[PDB]
């Protein structure tokens with residue numbers, strides 16, 4: 492593993508992934524385990540739920556995405572979409588799904604009515620924190636990964652397919668696999684416009 | 691201490707600390723470099739770079755917590771305010787400094803106008819990138835030997851904060867992170883069973 496800061500700087504968006512893993516599946520699980528154990532949540536509420544799809548379940552997820560898009564995308568746009576999914580995400584080793592348990596969120600809103608407007612946002616925040624931790628650690632072991640949002644289109648089909656609770660709200664999908672091309676250009680705005688220091 | 695842990699070790703190390711003091715294991719410039727690294731490399735939707743971070747040290751740190759006290763004075767009566775003041779003074783104000791996390795609403799609005807199809811996603815995505823920055827800074831601050839907590843005295847203080855440091859009106863405050871060298875260790879943390887929270891299917 493790199494240092495925290497090195498691992499963070501290493502993390503990029505990869506679309507050009509393949510269906511190979513440098514680590515055993517149990518170590519991929521242990522990444523997710525580590526994030527879910529230690530990434531913080533408001534009130535220690537532990538609303539985050541992670542589903543790791545590998546092998547044929549990974550392929551099924553991307554089939555669900557394609558089938559969902561077929562319903563809302565005219566034929567030609569679909570054909571381009573299909574080839575792009577098939578040549579990036581669906582070619583990967585696996586996909587991480589991030590959900591937020593709405594029973595927890597609703598429970599906190601009911602139990603702590605003074606903070607009730609804050610819990611949905613705090614739930615989205617802890618989800619994003621888990622997303623960054625997983626993203627970095629997957630790349631640290633040598634995968635490439637991207638962060639996708641084909642929810643809320645797919646959410647009911649995903650919950651149906653893997654028998655997930657109806658109250659798990661899908662946030663993001665993170666396909667990953669060994670990369671075959673390097674990241675491209677990234678623009679950076681000046682740090683001095685975005686950071687102020689006052690003593 | 692200054693030498694970094696691995697990503698996983700740094701993440702596991704990170705805990706909430708309320709018992710902090712006004713000392714630093716590192717020079718101020720290295721505190722700034724932690725923020726710099728987070729703001730450079732933490733992702734944002736569309737590479738939109740909506741996060742804005744204000745680091746308060748010294749007298750500015752103390753002023754922030756004085757603003758929080760004064761805000762609470764307005765909504766917390768009498769004897770009970772005395773307890774709140776002592777708790778702020780003994781938990782956040784006694785730290786070395788405070789990180790403030792903002793999101794640039796001109797950036798968000800700009801995205802919503804340029805990409806109307808995605809307009810309802812940008813505010814959520816902005817909150818998400820904010821949280822990613824918050825974790826990165828939290829973890830790195832603790833790795834160098836600080837304790838830190840994550841506070842939400844916004845939206846009570848937000849106008850007073852923007853007034854006091856002359857910050858743009860379109861910077862929306864998300865969270866405040868006081869930090870300092872810790873004087874007590876973290877307490878008990880409950881963990882729900884991981885198999886209720888993680889599923890693996892192949």
Ligand SMILES: Cc1cc2nc3c(=O)[nH]c(=O)nc-3n(C[C@H](O)[C@H](O)[C@H](O)COP(=O)(O)O)c2cc1C
Pocket residue numbers: 502503504505637638639640674677731732733734735736737738815816818819
């Ligand atoms: C909240 C958020 C949402 C994003 N949504 C998408 C997405 O739906 N599709 C996608 O391909 N990339 C998405 N990205 C990736 C960003 O565009 C990307 O991280 C940014 O352009 C910086 O590139 P990097 O990841 O290589 O550092 C998202 C990133 C974040 C932080």
Ligand SMILES: Cc1cc2nc3c(=O)[nH]c(=O)nc-3n(C[C@H](O)[C@H](O)[C@H](O)COP(=O)(O)O)c2cc1C
Pocket residue numbers: 529530531532533534535613614616617704705706707839840841842876879
């Ligand atoms: C989104 C979010 C909001 C939080 N809000 C507060 C808060 O306002 N005040 C506070 O003292 N701690 C707050 N916390 C800290 C959590 O209660 C804490 O992270 C959780 O109990 C786990 O403890 P740990 O941070 O020691 O791992 C927050 C954390 C998160 C992730």
Ligand code: NA
Pocket residue numbers: 691692693694695832833834835
């Ligand atoms: Na360290």
